[PDB]
Amino acid sequence: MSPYKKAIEITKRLLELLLSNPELAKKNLGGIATLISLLALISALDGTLDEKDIEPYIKKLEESL
Amino acid sequence: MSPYKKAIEITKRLLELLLSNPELAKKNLGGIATLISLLALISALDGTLDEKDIEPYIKKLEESL
Amino acid sequence: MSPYKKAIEITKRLLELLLSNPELAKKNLGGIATLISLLALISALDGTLDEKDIEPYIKKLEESL
Amino acid sequence: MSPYKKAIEITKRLLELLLSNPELAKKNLGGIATLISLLALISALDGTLDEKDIEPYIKKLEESL
Numbered sequence: 001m002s003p004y005k006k007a008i009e010i011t012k013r014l015l016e017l018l019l020s021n022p023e024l025a026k027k028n029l030g031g032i033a034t035l036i037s038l039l040a041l042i043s044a045l046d047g048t049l050d051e052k053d054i055e056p057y058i059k060k061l062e063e064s065l
Numbered sequence: 066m067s068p069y070k071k072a073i074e075i076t077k078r079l080l081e082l083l084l085s086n087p088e089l090a091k092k093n094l095g096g097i098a099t100l101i102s103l104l105a106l107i108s109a110l111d112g113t114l115d116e117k118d119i120e121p122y123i124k125k126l127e128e129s130l
Numbered sequence: 131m132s133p134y135k136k137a138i139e140i141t142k143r144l145l146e147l148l149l150s151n152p153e154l155a156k157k158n159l160g161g162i163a164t165l166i167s168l169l170a171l172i173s174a175l176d177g178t179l180d181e182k183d184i185e186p187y188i189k190k191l192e193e194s195l
Numbered sequence: 196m197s198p199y200k201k202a203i204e205i206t207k208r209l210l211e212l213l214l215s216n217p218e219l220a221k222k223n224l225g226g227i228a229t230l231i232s233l234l235a236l237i238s239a240l241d242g243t244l245d246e247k248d249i250e251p252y253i254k255k256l257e258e259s260l
Contacts, residue, residue, distance in 0.1 A: 003174030010170045010184055014163040017192065024159065024195065029089065030096015031160015033079040034229065037103045038167045040075045042174070044068030044107075054075060062082060065089065094219065095226015098209040099164065102233045105205045109198030109237070119205055127212065130219065133239030140235045140249060144228040147257060154224065154260065161225015168232045172239075 004046035011039045015057055025064045032061050069111035076104045080122055090129040097126050134176035141169045145187055155194040162191050199241035206234045210252055220259045227256050 015035050019025050025032060036057050043049035080100050084090050090097060101122050108114040145165050149155050155162060166187050173179040210230050214220050220227060231252050238244035 003177065003179040006179050006181060007167070007170035007174045010181075010188070011167045013188065014167055014191075018160060018163055021195070028160035028163075030083060030093035030099070030226065031164050033083055033093075034096055034099045034103065034160070034164045035167055037072070037076045037079060037100055037107075038164065038171065040072035041103065041107055041110075042167075042171055044072045044110075045171075045174075047068065049068040049071055051071060051075075058075070058078065058082075061079075065082065065086070095161070095213060095223035095229070098213055098223075099226050099229045099233065102202070102206045102209055102230055102237075105202035106233065106237055106240075109202045109240075112198065114198040114201050116201060116205075123205070123208065126209075130216070133242065133244040136244055136246060137232070137235035137239045140246075140253070141232045143253065144232060144256075147253075147260065148225060148228055151260070158225035158228075161229055164225070164229045165232055168229065168236065172232075172236055175236075175239075 002046065004042055007042045008039065008046065011035055011042060015039070019060055022064060029061065029064060032057075036061065067111060069107055072107050073104065073111065076100055076107060080104070084122075084125050087129060094126065094129060097122070097129075101126065132176060134172055137172050138169065138176065141165055141172060145169070149187075149190050152194060159191065159194060162187070162194075166191065197241065199237055202237045203234065203241065206230055206237060210234070214255055217259060224256065224259060227252075231256065
């Protein structure tokens with residue numbers, strides 16, 4: 001478990017928490033977006049960035065607009 | 066191709082989402098700001114930071130106050 | 131001494147500020163989450179990420195919903 | 196102007212914008228805190244983290260609670 005891999009898992013857990021309730025998601029759009037950016041940054045630091053792993057979250061965010 | 070370049074494109078996509086609607090942008094100013102900071106950080110990690118690539122977003126933020 | 135260690139201490143201070151008041155924490159869930167992600171990122175940059183150092187904050191976040 | 200130094204200046208500009216109006220600051224506490232964390236992280240990446248440069252912002256945030 002590389003440190004970056006642990007940080008990815010944590011950030012994905014945080015995204016699921018904030019998106020779990022759409023009413024809570026719509027009041028925290030900026031934070032969800034910032035988490036998605038952080039997930040990409042950490043992934044690129046780990047050298048395992050795959051766009052397919054990020055797009056589901058972007059599409060969920062878009063639906064919550 | 067670079068993983069940082071993919072993360073830059075994702076972060077700009079997220080900024081466009083949050084700025085698309087002036088009313089949603091005024092409700093998420095801190096999130097837009099944190100995304101502009103991240104865009105700058107990721108750009109510096111990628112070696113390529115041109116201020117001219119950030120400033121448009123900063124002026125858009127200033128517009129929403 | 132390490133600059134990353136100072137940034138870890140600052141980020142934990144900010145998390146304690148935002149969590150001190152349950153009412154302010156429920157209004158800033160996305161910010162608490164993004165700080166927990168950053169704490170993990172910075173820890174991974176410093177080489178030292180122990181999940182046990184992050185989990186208390188995650189459970190506190192889950193408490194505020 | 197090293198890329199990290201440009202990112203520091205941008206992040207400090209963003210902090211001043213969000214803190215410029217206390218009424219706007221109190222609605223964006225989480226984003227201000229996340230910006231302060233990012234300022235520390237970027238500073239440590241540049242190898243120029245001085246706690247004295249960060250504390251003024253933390254004290255302003257505390258006053259806005």
